Write an enzyme that holds these catalytic residues in place. Structure first.
Site, PDB file in Angstrom:
ATOM      1  CE1 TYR A  15      12.202   0.905  -2.330  1.00 54.51           C
ATOM      2  CE2 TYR A  15      12.777  -0.159  -0.062  1.00 54.51           C
ATOM      3  CZ  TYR A  15      11.847   0.357  -1.187  1.00 54.51           C
ATOM      4  OH  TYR A  15      10.427   0.596  -0.995  1.00 54.51           O
ATOM      5  CE  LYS A  33      15.195   2.964   1.529  1.00 53.92           C
ATOM      6  NZ  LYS A  33      15.743   4.192   1.140  1.00 53.92           N
ATOM      7  CG  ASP A 124      10.914  11.008  -5.927  1.00 47.52           C
ATOM      8  OD1 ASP A 124      10.087  11.299  -7.140  1.00 47.52           O
ATOM      9  OD2 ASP A 124      10.883   9.865  -5.615  1.00 47.52           O
ATOM     10  CE  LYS A 126       7.033   8.815  -5.810  1.00 44.23           C
ATOM     11  NZ  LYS A 126       7.111   7.797  -6.957  1.00 44.23           N
TER      12      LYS A 126
HETATM   13  C1  BLZ Z   1       1.954   3.421   6.887  1.00 49.58           C
HETATM   14  O1  BLZ Z   1       2.649   3.168   5.730  1.00 49.58           O
HETATM   15  C2  BLZ Z   1       3.807   3.706   5.875  1.00 49.58           C
HETATM   16  C3  BLZ Z   1       4.388   4.390   7.206  1.00 49.58           C
HETATM   17  C4  BLZ Z   1       5.441   5.025   7.190  1.00 49.58           C
HETATM   18  N1  BLZ Z   1       6.093   5.467   8.277  1.00 49.58           N
HETATM   19  C5  BLZ Z   1       7.152   5.674   7.791  1.00 49.58           C
HETATM   20  N2  BLZ Z   1       7.562   5.477   6.571  1.00 49.58           N
HETATM   21  C6  BLZ Z   1       8.763   5.371   5.755  1.00 49.58           C
HETATM   22  C7  BLZ Z   1       9.349   4.559   4.735  1.00 49.58           C
HETATM   23  C8  BLZ Z   1      10.536   5.305   4.303  1.00 49.58           C
HETATM   24  O2  BLZ Z   1      11.296   4.653   3.396  1.00 49.58           O
HETATM   25  C9  BLZ Z   1      10.515   4.087   2.159  1.00 49.58           C
HETATM   26  C10 BLZ Z   1      11.542   3.843   1.240  1.00 49.58           C
HETATM   27  C11 BLZ Z   1       9.203   4.772   1.730  1.00 49.58           C
HETATM   28  C12 BLZ Z   1       9.322   6.190   1.692  1.00 49.58           C
HETATM   29  C13 BLZ Z   1       8.085   6.580   1.109  1.00 49.58           C
HETATM   30  C14 BLZ Z   1       7.239   6.136   0.817  1.00 49.58           C
HETATM   31  C15 BLZ Z   1       7.076   4.757   0.534  1.00 49.58           C
HETATM   32  C16 BLZ Z   1       8.300   4.026   1.039  1.00 49.58           C
HETATM   33 CL1  BLZ Z   1       8.149   2.679   1.012  1.00 49.58          CL
HETATM   34  C17 BLZ Z   1      10.644   6.430   4.565  1.00 49.58           C
HETATM   35  C18 BLZ Z   1      11.796   7.569   4.268  1.00 49.58           C
HETATM   36  N3  BLZ Z   1      12.689   6.858   3.451  1.00 49.58           N
HETATM   37  O3  BLZ Z   1      11.631   8.506   4.735  1.00 49.58           O
HETATM   38  S1  BLZ Z   1       9.451   7.060   6.008  1.00 49.58           S
HETATM   39  C19 BLZ Z   1       6.396   4.835   6.010  1.00 49.58           C
HETATM   40  C20 BLZ Z   1       6.158   4.200   4.828  1.00 49.58           C
HETATM   41  C21 BLZ Z   1       4.674   3.663   4.817  1.00 49.58           C
HETATM   42  O4  BLZ Z   1       3.978   2.997   3.780  1.00 49.58           O
HETATM   43  C22 BLZ Z   1       4.895   2.940   2.680  1.00 49.58           C
END
Ligand code: BLZ
EC number: 2.7.11.22
Lengths: 291, 257
Positions: A15, A33, A124, A126
């Protein structure tokens, strides 16, 4: 975009990149993001944005904003302290206390029941997609593979370990059940400290599910022997006593877990119905210990 | 799974009000007309067939178009650009995998460039404020089909047929919510094929009586009766396929009693 200060990288993938960031004017801490962006706005972002906008619930991560310049696209999310995967690892020696497991499951089901009754499938679920804070909240995140099911969603995805048997057997449509399967696997993982069904491959994944829950037949799950990826040569394993699969669970937990891992996706418990399971009669909101 | 159907229906009923276009928008468009919109939608139907997209995709695209035209003035030479971008967005939302952009430029017959389609995509998203999960006639029929006793594929295809026809004519169909059009399409298909009526269980679930569906039913019956004489024929041609049990060849009843 000029109001945000980048604090640090918190994630990276196909992404784009995810940054912990600070609002320079309000002080609000956010997860940014960033989508790279000639194919236009990516399908997953279109879906993630329009679905999350509709989903305001205390157990679903908030989309705070969407900033759409000409050449970049940013999704602004509330910030949480870590993911369950990272928490489970930190807890490998001590274990996660059972009241906290229960609290987590309870909140996960609330977020999911909200999704499902708003016609959104997550798809998804997990440990690394579930986010936690220090005050005991858990929230569903990463709706990158989420789908609206106002009409049924065809099968194409989700990581193997948490993939439902009906998908592995090649069903035509998804249903809410696929999400419940995932939560059930995660539930058992919190309890045992070990992944429930850690397969190397699609076939190894099925076989691991079969070895634990029994090889399904036409009695247990009508239609199963007619599914695209079913084989008559599948080994016929016996179902295993749940007291040997999740030892430290009481009768109520074993009951809920087996209903969440029910073979027939039509009879697999819903999130809505799971919230009324006697397992949650004494649910509290404990605070985790985060590193 | 039975548990969620009520909550979902209630939610879609709520959402269809928020996602509705303005009913008198075409009068406020100085350069475009109902007729031009009809031509466009008919073309999108063809596009759907040619690229084998879901019917939901078509429905969503029309919703996006109508919402977009509710707040932006468009010249006739640009209407198709709005159309293509909406179809592309609808594909991106609904399809397992959408056609790539190049395919969408191809169907315009080199009228607009790649760059134009993508910028229109950005614009439509901005105007629609990213709210793409609109309820559609298709969604409601899907919900209604679960109340069949028993299920009948002819009924389903005909209901789908009638619902699609409603997309072509902004007058009168913009006056009706998707749940209402679906109500009508369902009863009419049911009546034509089996002679049964809008069932008691759906009256209870939707709050719509047969009487309350009457105004829309009278319009849809007229559309159905006049379908072979309509300038736009893509939908009838589509529904001649055995895929849809050739329902567009079925004779409509003369009256509704
Ligand atoms: C502390 O480590 C965090 C905190 C955090 N607070 C919000 N987020 C989100 C990131 C995100 O998008 C990315 C793609 C994502 C989602 C899930 C897992 C990893 C990643 Cl990188 C969110 C979403 N799309 O809803 S919320 C984080 C992420 C995070 O460590 C990754």
């Amino acid at each position: 975009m000029e109001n945000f200060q980048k604090v640090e990288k918190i994630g990276e993938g196909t992404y784009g990149v995810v940054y912990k960031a600070r609002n320079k004017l309000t002080g609000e801490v956010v997860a940014l993001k960033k989508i790279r962006l000639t194919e236009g706005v990516p399908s997953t972002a279109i879906r993630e944005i329009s679905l999350l906008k509709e989903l305001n619930h205390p157990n679903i991560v908030k989309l705070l904003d969407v900033i759409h310049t000409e050449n970049k696209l940013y999704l602004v999310f509330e910030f949480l302290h870590q993911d369950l995967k990272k928490f489970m690892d930190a807890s490998a020696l001590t274990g996660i206390p059972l009241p906290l497991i229960k609290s987590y499951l309870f909140q996960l089901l609330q977020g999911l029941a909200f999704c499902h009754s708003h016609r959104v499938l997550h798809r998804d679920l997990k440990p690394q997609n579930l986010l936690i804070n220090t005050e005991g909240a858990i929230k569903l995140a990463d709706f990158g593979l989420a789908r609206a099911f106002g009409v049924p969603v065809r099968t194409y995805v989700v990581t193997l370990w948490y993939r439902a048997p009906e998908i592995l057997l090649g069903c035509k449509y998804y249903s809410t059940a696929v999400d419940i399967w995932s939560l059930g696997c995660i539930f058992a993982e919190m309890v045992t400290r070990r992944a429930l069904f850690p397969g190397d491959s699609e076939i190894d994944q099925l076989f691991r599910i079969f070895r634990t829950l029994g090889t399904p037949d036409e009695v247990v799950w009508p239609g199963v022997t007619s599914m695209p990826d079913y084989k008559p040569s599948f080994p016929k394993w016996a179902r295993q006593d749940f007291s040997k699969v999740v030892p430290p669970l009481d009768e109520d937990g074993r009951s809920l877990l087996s209903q969440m891992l029910h073979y027939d996706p039509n009879k697999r418990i819903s999130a809505k119905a799971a919230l009324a399971h006697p397992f949650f009669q004494d649910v509290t909101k404990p605070v985790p210990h985060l590193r | 799974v039975p548990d969620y159907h009520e909550d979902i229906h209630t939610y879609l009923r709520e959402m269809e009000v928020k996602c509705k276009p303005k009913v008198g928008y075409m009068k406020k468009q100085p350069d475009i007309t109902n007729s031009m919109r009809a031509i466009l939608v008919d073309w999108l139907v063809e596009v759907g067939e040619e690229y084998k997209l879901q019917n939901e995709t078509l429905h969503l695209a029309v919703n996006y178009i109508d919402r977009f035209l509710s707040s932006m003035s468009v010249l006739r030479g640009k209407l198709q650009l709005v159309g293509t971008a909406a179809m592309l967005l609808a594909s991106k939302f609904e399809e397992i995998y959408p056609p790539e952009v190049a395919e969408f430029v191809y169907i315009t017959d080199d009228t607009y460039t790649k760059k134009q389609v993508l910028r229109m995509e950005h614009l439509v998203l901005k105007v629609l404020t990213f709210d793409l999960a609109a309820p559609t006639v298709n969604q409601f029929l899907t919900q209604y089909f679960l109340h069949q006793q028993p299920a009948n594929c002819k009924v389903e295809s005909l209901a789908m047929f009638l619902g699609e026809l409603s997309l072509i004519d902004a007058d009168p169909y913009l006056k009706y919510l998707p749940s209402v059009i679906a109500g009508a399409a369902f009863h009419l298909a049911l009546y034509t094929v089996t002679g049964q009526s809008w069932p008691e269980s759906l009256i209870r679930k939707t709050g719509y009586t047969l009487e309350s569906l009457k105004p829309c039913l009278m319009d849809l019956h007229q559309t159905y009766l006049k379908a072979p004489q309509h300038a736009q024929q893509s939908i009838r041609e589509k529904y001649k396929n055995s895929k849809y049990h050739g329902v567009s060849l079925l004779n409509p009843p003369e009256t509704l009693n």
